[PDB]
Design a protein around this ligand. Structure first.
Ligand SMILES: [Zn+2]
Ligand SMILES: [Zn+2]
Lengths: 247, 91, 115, 95, 76, 15
RNA sequence: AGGGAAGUCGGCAAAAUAGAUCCGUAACUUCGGGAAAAGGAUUGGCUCUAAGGGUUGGUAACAACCAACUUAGAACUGGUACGGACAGGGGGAAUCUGACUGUCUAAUUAAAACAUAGCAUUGCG
RNA sequence: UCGUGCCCCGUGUGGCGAAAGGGAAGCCGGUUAAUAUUCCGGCACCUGGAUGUGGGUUUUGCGCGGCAACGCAACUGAACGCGGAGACGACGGCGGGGGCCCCGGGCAGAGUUCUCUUUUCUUCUUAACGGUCUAUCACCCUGGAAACAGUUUGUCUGGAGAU
RNA sequence: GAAGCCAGAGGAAACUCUGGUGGAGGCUCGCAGCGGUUCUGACGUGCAAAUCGAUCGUCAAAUCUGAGCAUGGGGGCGAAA
């Protein structure tokens, strides 16, 4: 046979992500003395729409403590942030929406966003619209913090990891149906070349493992092993259960 | 003089996409295109600019809110429990 | 009466820079004239409205005209509008006075704590 | 309450509604009490507090918005700040 | 091209060194007379009503500045 | 204005 | 010419309808549509009438000046024909089928094929 | 004398890539067998470089006026920063301007003219570059509005100050 | 002829009806353009190694299109033939 679409997506070429309309990556300030020991104030000047991202971004300008310069940063906006608002990033910052605090300085039950997996990677968890990470446990002796992710997972991260207090703006985006095909086309033409998608059962045996036959059918179980060969993975991969659950 | 008995703002969609899907999308379309009272100036001039972005025409203030609503009940409960935790931590 | 016209440059496409207007010459010939793009007014760096008193030109055309025509005789003149300058003055004065009152109250509280 | 006393002031005494009229009353030194709504812009709020500090005039911070302040004054428009010039029959000055 | 509305300014422009030529346009349908002086950058013109002040000003130009009355036809 | 024009002015002064 | 599908595997092809104004329009239906449904009455020319406006000027509800295109009504009149050429829906009763708009086998197959929204499942902190 | 030395800033440190993207500046008339916004004539503009005159400022050293929006021929401004312009989708109606189309009178010319037709047709033009007077939005001063008012084809504006 | 808006008649209100305004829709007739349904079509060593005529589908968008660039054969690309 030939190289499948799944294998061809990893070479780059037409399958790379869109770049032009997307201005700056959304991440926290680098961890420094001001955030590690006290707090630093920044001014939220713009709330912008990121093409390809459902969550609005916030352009916030801070001051350089070491030189005479204004530093602009791009944060993921939480629901309630407005232009002209002073946000405070640091250890001694207050528990206000938009403030960035380490997880050791927040109480349990606090919901945070753009949470760092490791102190210094400028935010990894809970970054999409309407999502949040819940601070569910603390361990001061080991310096650890248990958090709950939007997938239902619970994870343990170092307590020096930072997170913006609040819930990411743009919630309920997926509730509205994308009535027309053009709406999905516009949604994916700003992200990457993955739309429209052709079913493998409508293909030829040269094109995909599901192709061929006088009737359109899979021909075997749709669950495929984890250690399958490259190109043998097409369908449900390493599934522990299948079917519709009653709940 | 009401022109459509039931579809309302979904009347632009014709007979297409299904009655239930038109009924579902009617709520987000109405809530999205409605005008809102500003928290900062009190004028009925807050309208959606992009998804999650709500700008006021009078005072020129831009807020981050829900996708089709100016605020979400999850964010309101977040504010409530957040001020709860602020009060507990402070005193 | 020839009323139909041609371009005068070798660009045949109706692009943004290929802008023309129709004139009638003193020889009684209906011709085109290639014109430049319209200049836009400078805007306030705080609120974004058009600054009054400053002409709307192309970026390099500003270097050919004098300084009083490119600015307004005021602090932040030709860069910010008058309302924004007034708000800056009021905000600066009020925040400095608040800092003085806060420092006096902090010194009084520190003296009371020490005593 | 504060709304009832405000309505008594409207029906009995004299007031000025608005930022510019409040500034004129504060400059004239005839303002007896300055009411500032919650949703007043903070620069205007601090400026009016500074003017009242200069004029030795009490400031009441109304917890409602300018819609609610106009409604309490009995008007169908918004009012961010206001000044009273005569208390009338109300007991609004001693509080 | 520039128009000067002052006789003394036209005189100073004529005494300027860059002035290489002066010429006179007589419009009888309009009843006016134009004195045009060619400087390096600008052609300066003065418009007058038909009177003896035109000939007085003609005398008032310097003799080094050569002056011509324009013809009826601009033949090459 | 621009550094080249300012340099022209200060070079005229220096000359 | 008369007949009007008797022709033919099969109404293939041709004919028939057609613009605009007015009367009127069923089943079904996701109430949005169907719908230009269906089925009817009219249209030339000429001579008139009526209505729909602007500028300036101390009951001005009035004077003066100026202006162009629509709309309605009436009389008269030619006739074999009046959207006089051109231009321009045939319609209806049902059944199967794909939801629709869209896309493909350049050079024999445009489709119940593909895609689509919606639905569900899987792996990953 | 300098070609030699002394400082200062140092976070960052290449090139190619569009005759439809961004971009400093030229119009008119005439001219050849064949070129012309390129030649010729007239009238301008931009960029870079020097360098004077007039005018301006200054013994209150680096202008004056207007309440203000701001104005005027000038009217010091290094390092380091801030901001604007460059610099921006598609569609719908509305309003202004140029050009084209249509109607009337007048001069000149051409055609029709059995009859009719004060007739039908043709020329009646004004560039770049400047001066001056104006041009939607917006902004400023007075003033404080419900018997709510202003106002668009389209319902927005106003005690955060409308008419 | 969808939201939004105006007026009138009701209704205690909410709302109901009527007349307007407005100009939405991967709506529709249809010119260009794009495409290629049908004809015992023309043509069949043709004008043409895929053309010509009538007819037909679509026509404000998942529409048409240029230039620069990217993907190169045990590969690519594929609304999938
Ligand atoms: Zn506001
Ligand atoms: Zn401003």
């Amino acid at each position: 046979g030939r190289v499948i679409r799944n294998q061809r997506k990893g070479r780059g070429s037409v399958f790379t992500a869109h770049t032009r309309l997307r201005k700056a990556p959304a991440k926290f300030r680098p961890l420094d003395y001001a955030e590690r020991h006290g707090y630093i104030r920044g001014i939220v000047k713009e709330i912008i729409h990121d093409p390809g991202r459902g969550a609005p971004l916030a352009r916030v300008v801070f001051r350089s403590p070491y030189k005479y310069k204004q530093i602009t940063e791009t944060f993921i906006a939480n629901e309630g942030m407005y232009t002209g608002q002073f946000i405070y990033a640091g250890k001694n910052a207050a528990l206000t929406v938009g403030n960035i605090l380490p997880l050791s300085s927040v109480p349990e039950g606090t919901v945070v966003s753009n949470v760092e997996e490791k102190p210094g990677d400028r935010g990894a968890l809970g970054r999409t619209s309407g999502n949040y990470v819940t601070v569910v446990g603390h361990n001061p002796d080991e310096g650890k913090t248990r958090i709950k992710l939007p997938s239902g997972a619970k994870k343990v991260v170092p307590s020096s990891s930072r997170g913006m207090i609040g819930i990411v703006a743009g919630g309920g985006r997926t509730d509205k149906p994308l009535l027309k095909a053009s709406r999905a086309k516009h949604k994916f033409a700003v992200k990457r070349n993955r739309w429209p998608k052709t079913r493998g059962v409508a293909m030829n045996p040269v094109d995909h493992p599901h192709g061929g036959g006088n009737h359109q059918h899979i021909g075997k179980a749709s669950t495929i092993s984890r250690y399958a060969a490259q190109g043998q993975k097409a369908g449900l991969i390493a599934a522990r259960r299948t079917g519709l659950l009653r709940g | 003089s009401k022109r459509t008995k039931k579809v309302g703002i979904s009347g632009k969609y014709g007979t297409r996409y299904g009655a239930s899907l038109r009924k579902l999308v009617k709520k987000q379309e109405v809530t999205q295109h409605a005008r809102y009272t500003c928290t900062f100036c009190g004028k009925n001039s807050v309208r959606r600019t992009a998804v999650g972005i709500w700008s006021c025409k009078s005072c020129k203030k831009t807020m981050a809110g829900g996708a089709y609503t100016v605020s979400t009940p999850a964010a309101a409960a977040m504010r409530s429990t957040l001020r709860r935790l602020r009060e507990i931590t402070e005193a | 009466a020839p009323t139909r016209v041609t371009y005068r440059r070798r660009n045949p496409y109706n692009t943004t820079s290929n802008r023309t207007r129709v004139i009638k010459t003193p020889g009684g010939q209906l011709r085109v004239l290639h014109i430049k793009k319209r200049g836009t007014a400078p805007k306030c760096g705080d609120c974004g409205i058009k600054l009054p008193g400053i002409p709307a030109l192309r970026p390099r055309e500003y270097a050919t005209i004098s300084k009083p025509k490119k600015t307004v005789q005021r602090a932040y003149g030709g860069s910010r509008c008058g309302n924004c300058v007034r708000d800056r003055i009021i905000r600066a004065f009020l925040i400095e006075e608040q800092k003085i009152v806060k420092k006096v109250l902090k010194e009084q509280s520190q003296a009371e704590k020490k005593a | 309450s504060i709304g009832a006393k405000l309505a008594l002031v409207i029906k009995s005494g004299k007031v000025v509604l608005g930022y510019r009229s409040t500034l004129k009353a504060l400059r004239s030194g005839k303002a007896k009490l300055i009411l500032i709504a919650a949703n007043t812009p903070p620069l205007r709020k601090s400026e009016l507090e500074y003017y009242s500090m200069m004029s030795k005039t009490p400031v009441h911070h109304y917890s409602g918005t300018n819609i609610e302040l106009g409604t309490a004054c009995g008007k169908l428009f918004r009012c961010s700040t206001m000044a009273i010039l005569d208390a009338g029959d109300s007991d609004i000055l001693a509080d | 091209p520039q128009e000067v509305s002052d006789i003394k300014k036209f005189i100073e422009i004529c005494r300027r060194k860059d002035a290489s030529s002066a010429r006179i346009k007589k419009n009888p349908k309009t009843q006016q007379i134009k004195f045009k002086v060619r400087c390096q950058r600008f052609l300066y013109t003065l418009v007058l009503k038909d009177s003896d002040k035109a000939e007085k000003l003609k005398q008032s130009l310097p003799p080094n500045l050569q002056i011509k009355d324009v013809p009826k036809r601009n033949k090459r | 204005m621009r550094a080249k024009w300012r340099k022209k002015r200060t070079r005229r002064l220096k000359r």
